[model samples]
Every structure is written in C-alpha cells, then in structure tokens.
Target chain A: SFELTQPSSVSVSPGQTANITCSGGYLGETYRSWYQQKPGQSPVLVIYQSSKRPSGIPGRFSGSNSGNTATLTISGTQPLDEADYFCQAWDFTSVVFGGGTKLTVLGQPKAAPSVTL
Target chain B: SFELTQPSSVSVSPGQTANITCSGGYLGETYRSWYQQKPGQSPVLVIYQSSKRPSGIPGRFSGSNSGNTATLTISGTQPLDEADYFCQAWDFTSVVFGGGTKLTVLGQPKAAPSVTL
Candidate 1:
C-alpha cells in the first residue's frame, strides 16, 4: 500500500489564498484530490485535480499540480477558511488522506505596527 | 452545511458476521459515513456513509443502512479480530467518527453439513 505524506500544519492571511499540497510515491497513479472539513461540516470536495470541481463548490477554491504533487488553493478567504484541509489520492480501492492541515485566521490588527515608539 | 447518514452492507460466512443500518433528516442531510475500501492493498477502512470508500478497497464488499440510520458488521472473521469498526458523523465544523467498535472473531464450525451417499 502506498503512503501519503502531508504537512502537519500551515497558515495564511485572509483574502490571501492558501495552498496545501500532497506528495506520494505511486510510480504513476491517477486520481489525486483535495477535501475540506470545516469545524462541524462533513468533508467537501474543494478541488478535483487535473483541475476540476465536483459541482456546486464556490469559485474561490481551485486546484493545480506539478508532478506527483497536487495543490489545493483557496482564494479570498472568509471566516470559514479556518478549517482543516486534507489532500488525498484515489488509488481506486482506498483513499488515503494527508495528516491534515489546520488554518488559522488572524485577528484584526491592533492599530497596525507602529514605526517606532 | 449537511449532515451524514450511512448504511451497513456485506455478508459474512464461516468467518462471517453480518449487519447493516442509516436514516435522518437535516431534512435532507447527506454527510453519511460507511468507508470500507479493503486492506494491505490500501483498503484501510470498510465503509463511509453514502456507501463510499476512500480509495483502494476489496470485493466481497458490501454496505446497507436503514434510512438515515447506519450499521457495519463483519462475517466469517479471523484473528486480527480484523480491527476496530466505526461510523462517522461528518458535519463541516467537525468531522466526527463514531466510537470505534472492537470486532470479535467467531470460531469455525466443527462438523460439516450431513450428506447422504
């Protein structure tokens, strides 16, 4: 069985798209994708690599790739963006999920960093 | 956001234990769980409501749930006890997998069916 190695964590700013990628060794298998599991929501298909959307997903979410690695990109983030993201490979018989990526939304800036005291 | 529902499927024979169950109403929630891909070859799990498995799964495979209710049981089992079985509650905010169940393997039948020659 092939194993999918995913990053333990990641962070990105609101409105600034965040990207998460998954890598594995399957020689040359097909079917690599991404899913998002918001706090209490079930997993939803964000990106179906080869660059496709399942159906009613928002346009802010997109997918792309280079080699055996696939990326899930979320643009113009919202409060909902602070959820868990996972990358996977569809080997047909089994779907392997990456460890899981945690997204944190930054709080409002106090008053912007002062130049000097 | 949607809710999850699943059904138990498959039949167990000497090493067989059979069970299936799912039902609900987010009115129309369908986050159901019943993942059963297979093993070694990357089966990993057995059922994911909506009767969907992750990726690499095995045959002799099956799943069935009652309405929005869900159930999963094994048949003609072996030591391994196989592994822990579970149902999942996937809303978006949080992905909740049911408390894992420990599957017990039943012993083989001592005598064969009677036959007349």
Candidate 2:
C-alpha cells in the first residue's frame, strides 16, 4: 500500500503562482498525474506523467517530480483556478491520490472607502 | 478523453448492503478501480483491476465489471462506510474518475411514541 500526502490548503492572489506538493510513494517508479476538481463536479485531468498536460488544459498548470516528492504548480493563477488540486501516482498495478490541496485565489482588495473626513 | 458515471447518491441502513455503479470507458481494454473519499480528505483505493482489493482493506468491499460498467458493492454497511465513492478507469495514457456517489447510512427509524390513554 502506498501513501500520499499534500498540504490541506493554499492561498494565492490573482496573477501569482501557487505550488502544491505531494509526497510518499515510489517516485522513481511511479508516474505522477494531477487533477483539478471544482465543487459538485468531476475531477479533470490536468497533468500526466509528471509533466505532460492533457489536451484542452491551459499551459499555466505544470507538474514535476524530484526524489520522493511531486509538485504541481499553477502560474498566473486566475479566479477560475480556485479549486481542489490532487496528485495521483501509479503504483505499478494501481493508482494512489494525495490528500488534495484547496486553492483559494484571493479577490483583489476592495478600493479604499471614499468617505469624507 | 474518457468518462465515468456514478450515481449521485445512495442510501442504506446499517447491516444492509450498498452497490454503486460506474459506467463508461472501454471495459475490456481498461482497468477499473474504486476509491473512497471522506470529506476534506484524500481518496483511498479500495479495489483495483476490477476486483482486486488492496492490503488492509476490508473484505466487505468488492468490485466487479461487466461490459462497459463497473460496480462497487459493500456488504453489511456500517456507519464508517458513509462517504463519497469514486470509480476510475484508465485509458493507458490517462485516467478518469466519476462524479462520485455520496453514501448515507440511514439511521434506524425511531420507534413511535406510545400514545397516552
């Protein structure tokens, strides 16, 4: 049995970058994949084999693996990128998924109140 | 791209049975797997390669496939069995997961209060 762990949550502002890590698995033998899931919807595959993005996915999402850990990075995060990200790895015969990381893209700060003193 | 479909929700009483269905994908060409996910947690693989249960998994959880559909059945449902169930299928290059079925173990019906004479 393989185990995978990931951060519980991550926050980033629009146009910034967010990186989520997944560890615990035979990184050398496992082929890592990444998925993005929104509330009430099925998970969509974003990356496969650690770095290959499936068709229809934006280039901002990238994946890489080093040693025993795999990373999923979202560059120039957009509002639509606010969702749960999961990392999965193939364990020779089966697949295992990370705990998932909830990404919160913070909304731009509200304009200062224009109140007369 | 492949697709998997599972029931939106299922309900069963403790000590009963529950079966969730997942349909889609090229059945014979792909391997089907089942996973259980509790809210706010990562998914745990219960069964893979259609009917092979992973180590430490209970025997009550089993999986089977027929034609283009796969099924995950639980015998003697327990309170701890209430969670989201997902089915996955691999297309050799990538994997896809179903929308997930929310299992609810309905509590025993409360006994009607005796009417006052």
Candidate 3:
C-alpha cells in the first residue's frame, strides 16, 4: 500500500541539467538505483548503490540520496536523452518503484537573441 | 553490452496458466526478480530472489530459473492480471532487465458453426 512518489515528467534544455526526484519512506535508508527506459525497450541501469554507474553508463548520469529523497541527475543533456526514468528502493520486505519520470531534452535556442536578426 | 530476451507479447485465456521466459547470461546465476506494471503506473515486484513472492502477493504467481532462462508463471490467472511483465537479473557488474512481455488475457469467443452457402 505504501509507495514511492515521483513527478509525472520533467523537461530540460539541451546543455542543461535535469534532476528527477524519487521520494519514499525507506528511500534514503535503502540502496537505491536509477534506470532509463526507451520506447519498446527494457530498462537500462544507470545508477546503482545510490551513486555508482555501471561500466558503460555515461558519466552525465549521476545519483544522490538524502533524507527520504533520491535524485537522478542528467547533465549536459541532449535531445536523444528524452525518455522515461525510474528509481527503485527497498521496502519492508520488497522492492518498490517510483511512478516514473519522463525527461524531455528541449532545445530552446530561439529566444536567446532574435529581435535584431 | 549483454541483454535479456523475452517474447514481445503473450496472450492467454481467462483462468488459464501463463509463463513468460527471460533468457540471458547470468539469468540463473543469482537472485532474479519479476515485476508487474500496468499502464501509467510504476512496477510492483511480483517475484523475488528467484521463486518467492512478497507478502500479500497471490500464490498464482511463481518464478523459477535454470541455465540461462528464468520464468515467471501465473497459474489459474484472471483477467485482472493482464499487464506488462519484466524480469531483472544480475550481471556481475550491474543489474539488467528483459525487453518486457505484454500479457493479455483473452475473452472466450464461440466457434462458428459449419455453414453451407
């Protein structure tokens, strides 16, 4: 009955950073992990043991946790990074998942300087 | 670079048994888990540490593994059990997941009688 909470989606500009948060009762107390899932694809582990990335996972993907909150950060993001992200943590006797966050790597280069051009 | 394999989709009759297989390296080596995810929701752990279910999970769901294949079986299942099923296993360095199998519970359709036209 208890569950983890996460935003439905998040949006970030290219070259910016996007942070997805997962909050739960036992989140910070347990080892948490982050995963990326593309359309019609399985989840690829991004972070394990809270902050460690697997061998081939990009360095841009990082994780941190504190005080019932776990965060997965994607830095210097690109358009290709648009996908669904999820985090998992231990419960009393089982593993629980967040509601899953959708990341949209936006490119907003149009508004920086356009009035005179 | 390794990956897990699963049938893209499976269909079963109501009150029948269903088995979904996940095949990959280390699939049978250590603890494995299965999750159930309905649309617009996070996954719920169904099978854990190979063949065990969490408290409150029905006895109809069970897991088993051998060689490079792990299976999640639902015996005498109902229509409410139709959902997306995914398997996870260890790979020495990290955890991995299957491509996900869509379980669809079928309705009973009557056979057509022989007709002469």
Candidate 4:
C-alpha cells in the first residue's frame, strides 16, 4: 500500500545508456514490471516478473532489483526509445505504479531541411 | 482476447462532466480498473472492480459497465481533475490498458497575472 517514486524525466542521446530507478517499501516482496507509454499511445509491457521480457520486447531492455529498489536500464538508446516509462508492482490489495519517467532521446533529426521552396 | 479502445482525448469546461469509455470483449466477465495519471505524477487507482472507489477517492469519480464496455465518469469537474485517465482489464492471458483519454478543463485562470513587470 505504498507509493512508488521515480524521476519525472530523464534525457540521453543516441547510443547512450539511461537508467530509470524505482524505490519504495516492499518492492522486492513482489514482482516488478515495466511499461513503455509513447505519446498518443497506450502503455506497453516491457518487463515483467522482475527481469523477464515478454514475447517480443527487445534484449536491450533489462530489469533488476535490490532490496526495495528496482531499475530498468536501456542500453545503446535510440530515437525510438523516447517515451514515458513506468514501474509497477502489486501490494496485498491493489496494483501500484511509479510516477512515469519521461525518456527524451536528444540529438535526433528534426523536420527535413530539404522541404524549403 | 481483445485490446481496449477509447477516445484519444476529451475536453470539458469547469463544473461540467465528462465520461471516458472503454470497450472490448470480456470486460464484463472480469473486474475493470481505472487509473488517473496527472502530468508528472504516477497513475493513481481511482476506481476498481468496475464500480468500487478506494478509501480516499471522492464520490465525484464513479464507474459503470454495459456488456462489453465500461465507463468512468467525473462529475462537476475541476482543474485538478484534468489528467490522462486509463482503463485497465485482464484478458484471457494478458493485461490490457486503453489508449488513455486526456481530459482538459477549459476557461481556467492562468497561474499568474499576464501583466508582467
């Protein structure tokens, strides 16, 4: 019945590593899961059962926990990684979600310069 | 065995009401849950088990169901009610969340006076 806390946002450039952490009481007492919610889309399950990836989630997404804290690390980040991330767990009575973390992939190509008249 | 579908966004004036709906198969067979995720905050469970509010949620937030669809209604809305609301349910083998609905409260005062120093 405790609230999970995570950073409101994090930024990393292409090929960099971003580690999003979640901390709260009794986190290890149950399974930890992660979700990726892109803008204008529903959240997608990335990691479940602490560190296990679902059927089609990439290998770069990994999960691990220590005591009451858990981490989701994305290695060699890409532009496609830009989204909001959330950590989830269940207590004795209900499910809880961490304040979503916004991952900003910096240095990406913007509107094409060749479109000028 | 279906993914929930809902409106991408909804707008309402202060003191008005808004209803966000979720539709899919198996919605009636299992309990439906709703989460309120204001910007920069973790998603909070507002309504659970289709129509049961938790200990602290106000009566302004309510839930209902009709066959394959479920709805979360916010009555007499205020600026604090503005957030992305998500509906969640379990499928035969997995969990599904609707593509969230963004509720915007219109005609509110700006945080500060526009006449600058």
Computed on alpha carbons, the lDDT of every model, listed in order, comes to 0.24, 0.24, 0.24, 0.24
TM-scores for every predicted model? 0.12, 0.14, 0.12, 0.11
Off by over 4 Å in 2: A1-117, B1-99
Query: Model 2 over residues B36-87: C-alpha lDDT tens digits?
Result: 3333432222322222321221222112112112223332222222222123
lDDT of 3 by residue, A1-117 (tens): 112222222232122122323322221222223343333322222322222321221222112112112223332222122222122211111111112223223221211111221
Question: Local error of candidate 4 at B75, Å?
Answer: 36
Q: Candidate 2 at B12: error in angstroms?
A: 6.9
Q: Rank the candidates by TM-score, best first.
A: 2, 3, 1, 4
Worst 10 residues of 3 chain A by lDDT: A89-98
- DockQ-derived CAPRI band for the predicted complex in model 1: incorrect
Error of 2 at B59 (Å): 35
Cα displacement (angstroms), candidate 2, residue A97, comes to: 9.3
Chain A vs native chain A, TM-score per candidate:
0.13, 0.15, 0.13, 0.12
Q: Which stretches of candidate 3 lie over 4 Å from their true place?
A: A1-99, A111-117, B1-117
TM-score of 3: 0.12
Pairs that collide in candidate 2 are none
Candidate 3 lDDT, B36-101, residue by residue in tens:
333443322232222232222122211111211222323222212222212221121111111222
Per-model DockQ against the true two-chain complex: 0.01, 0.02, 0.01, 0.01
Query: What's model 2's overall lDDT?
Result: 0.24
What's the CA error at residue A116 for candidate 4, in Å?
22
User: What does candidate 2's lDDT look like per residue over A49-107, in tens digits?
Assistant: 22232222122211211111222333222212223222322222111211222322322
**In lDDT terms, which candidate is top?**
2
